[PDB]
Amino acid sequence: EVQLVESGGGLIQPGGSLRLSCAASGFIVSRNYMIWVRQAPGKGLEWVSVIYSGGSTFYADSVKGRFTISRDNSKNTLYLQMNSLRAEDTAVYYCARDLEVAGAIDYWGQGTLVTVSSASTKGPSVFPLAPSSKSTSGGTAALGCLVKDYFPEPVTVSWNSGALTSGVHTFPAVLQSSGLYSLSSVVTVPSSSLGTQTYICNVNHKPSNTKVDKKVEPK
Amino acid sequence: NLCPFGEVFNATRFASVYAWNRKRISNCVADYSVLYNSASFSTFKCYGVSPTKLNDLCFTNVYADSFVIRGDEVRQIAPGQTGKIADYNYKLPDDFTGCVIAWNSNNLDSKVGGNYNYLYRLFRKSNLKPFERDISTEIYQAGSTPCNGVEGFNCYFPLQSYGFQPTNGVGYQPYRVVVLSFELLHAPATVCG
Amino acid sequence: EIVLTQSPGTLSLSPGERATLSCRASQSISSSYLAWYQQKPGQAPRLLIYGATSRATGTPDRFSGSGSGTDFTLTINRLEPEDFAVYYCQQYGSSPGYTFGQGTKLEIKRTVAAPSVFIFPPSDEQLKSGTASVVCLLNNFYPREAKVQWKVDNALQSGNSQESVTEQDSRDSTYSLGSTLTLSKADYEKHKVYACEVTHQGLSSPVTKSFNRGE
Ligand SMILES: *[C@@H]1O[C@H](CO)[C@@H](O)[C@H](O)[C@H]1NC(C)=O
């Protein structure tokens, strides 16, 4: 299968350095035009860098002299070395294969989030949002998990290890006035299921080594 | 006895840059100030040689290479440049001794609906060496799967068309280019001014 | 250098209608060097069109590109809920080699749908930490405009709540919203009735969910 898998994004202090990786399958990185494009939170797309099959490289003015694109043919991997990082470099970074007039940018990696900040890492607290409704109402119950006070983004939430996806809403994180994020994840289910089915939110915050499975039970 | 520069500069048709043309100039008297002095040129950059100087020298051969590229690409026809044209189509050496001359040819090489006869090489594994000319049309394998001479996903024809239409912006308009390079080995000097 | 200006900035249309998205370039480019992308939330951009008119792999015929010079258009026929996205244009012929428009955000309309409203008291676990978060959930409504009024013993609360809204659902075209009221434990214990009052076009009068602390 043909794809581009990115890694390396995460929290870095201003002035620091990070290397992003883009592992390709199928495409031969060294035979293609390969690019990096970034997207700051809520903003549009910004082209960052390109490397040619013959080895020529080019850079946007906003990163020139600080970023270096490169590749390793033996690992079929594209890299972006970012130095002297600044707050405005905070973005989701995409690698992609470019075909210019033969097809523009037809394949993109999934993105890796880079956060440039001096705030400390902190793991979330996970609290239940317990269903109020009685199992006998004949209607719909809502339940969830409050994932509170964490830094940096992102966290992931699943329900019943990924078996429950219908009716799930995981909300965008909000930055609180403390500088820590918070988010809720909720699911709606038949009230009659509260007595027969167990509901567990699985929360992972990798930067803080926090992996929590919380059972949400009626009260 | 007079060098046939008009043959080169006034040719009805010019080559695509990937298949650039080379004219060998020998056993003639040149005179490039008559060539230079000509408001008829948007680019006339000389490297090493000065122009009013060339009337004085004697080289054992002179090459006139010529082709068409986009206005935005003329800057790549210089020592030490990189980009699709310099890397994969026409490459000057770092120590180039010669002159690059170019003029806008929109009134000759553009057509309503696009003239698609001029091509450039888009895909190539490696950079050209200086004065290397690659006219292969093998399907370019961009992935792991062999193309077996058939175009498809990850199997691209290596040459692509410029689309020269008259109302294009100037950077997208055709420019005719002539590169003069001056050859001094150790033998007869057959081209003087 | 070249700027691509897309319009309208935002667009909201019903299923079965046709969206017309414009991309204007600050200088004339050859149409061989313009492309369109669709970006749904959480995903990388997806190529729709390249060379102004050529459909990429997987792009159905209801997506059509046109234009030349300084003016390009993407047309989306037979709109459906899954067409909710941000659409970007892109040039790749002029300096510095890649430039994107700022995007048109497309919303897909549906029949009005009132939120289902739920309120959640703080957990005993959280109270043990010294803080109380009270959560009001507005589930699966349309349109996006909705008002959440927190009341604590009937005093309207301002300055101590934060909202988050989901992106439009790709299947049912609804939004959901959560509002969190944050108090210290000591403040939370000074009051009885916690209520969130919800206003929305689909509700003939505001809906209030409430609880009594400790009940
Ligand atoms: C090309 O043709 C024009 C015709 O007016 C002529 O003036 C010019 O000298 C020619 N270029 C040469 C001879 O290099």
Numbering used by the authors:
A (entry chain H): 1 to 82, 82A, 82B, 82C, 83 to 100, 100A, 100B, 101 to 214
B (entry chain A): 334 to 526
C (entry chain L): 1 to 10, 12 to 28, 28C, 29 to 108, 108A, 109 to 214
Original paper wording:
S1 contains an N-terminal domain and a receptor binding domain (RBD) that recognizes the target cell receptor angiotensin-converting enzyme 2 (ACE2). Here, we describe the molecular basis of the SARS-CoV-2 RBD recognition by the anti-RBD monoclonal antibody CoV11 isolated early in the COVID-19 pandemic and show how its unique mode of binding the RBD determines its neutralization breadth. CoV11 utilizes a heavy chain VH 3-53 and a light chain VK 3-20 germline sequence to bind to the RBD. CoV11 binds the RBD in what has become the characteristic mode of binding for VH 3-53 encoded SARS-CoV-2 neutralizing antibodies by closely overlapping the ACE2 binding site on the RBD.
To get a better understanding of how CoV11 recognizes SARS-CoV2 spike, we determined the crystal structure of CoV11 Fab in complex with the wt and the delta (B.1.617.2) variants of the SARS-CoV-2 RBD. CoV11 Fab-RBDwt crystals belonged to space group P212121 and diffracted to 2.05 Å with one CoV11 Fab-RBDwt complex in the asymmetric unit. The wt RBD complex was refined to an R/R free of 0.166/0.198. Binding to the RBD is achieved mainly through CDRs H1, H2, H3, and L1 [19.7%, 21.0%, 20.3%, and 19.9% of the total buried surface area (BSA) of CoV11, respectively] with small contributions from framework residues in the heavy chain (12.4%) and CDR L3 (4.9%); light chain framework residues (1.5%) and CDR L2 (0.3%) make almost no contribution to the total CoV11 BSA. CoV11’s CDR H3 interaction with the RBD begins with the arginine preceding the CDR H3, ArgFWR H394 , which makes hydrogen bonds to RBD residues AsnRBDwt487 and TyrRBDwt498 and van der Waals contacts with PheRBDwt486. CDR H3 LeuCDR H396 packs against LeuRBDwt455 , PheRBDwt456 , and TyrRBDwt489 , while GluCDR H397 makes hydrogen bonds to TyrRBDwt453 and LysRBDwt417 . Aside from ArgFWR H394 and GluCDR H397 , most of the CDR H3 interface interactions are hydrophobic. The bulk of CoV11’s interactions from the light chain reside in CDR L1. In the first sequence change, the VH 3-53 germline sequence has Thr at position 28, while CoV11 has Ile. This ThrFWR H128 -to-Ile change in CoV11 increases van der Waals contacts with AlaRBDwt475 and GlyRBDwt476 . The second sequence difference, a germline SerCDR H131 -to-Arg change in CDR H1 adds one hydrogen bond to the CoV11–RBD interface; the side chain of SerCDR H131 is too short to make a similar hydrogen bond.
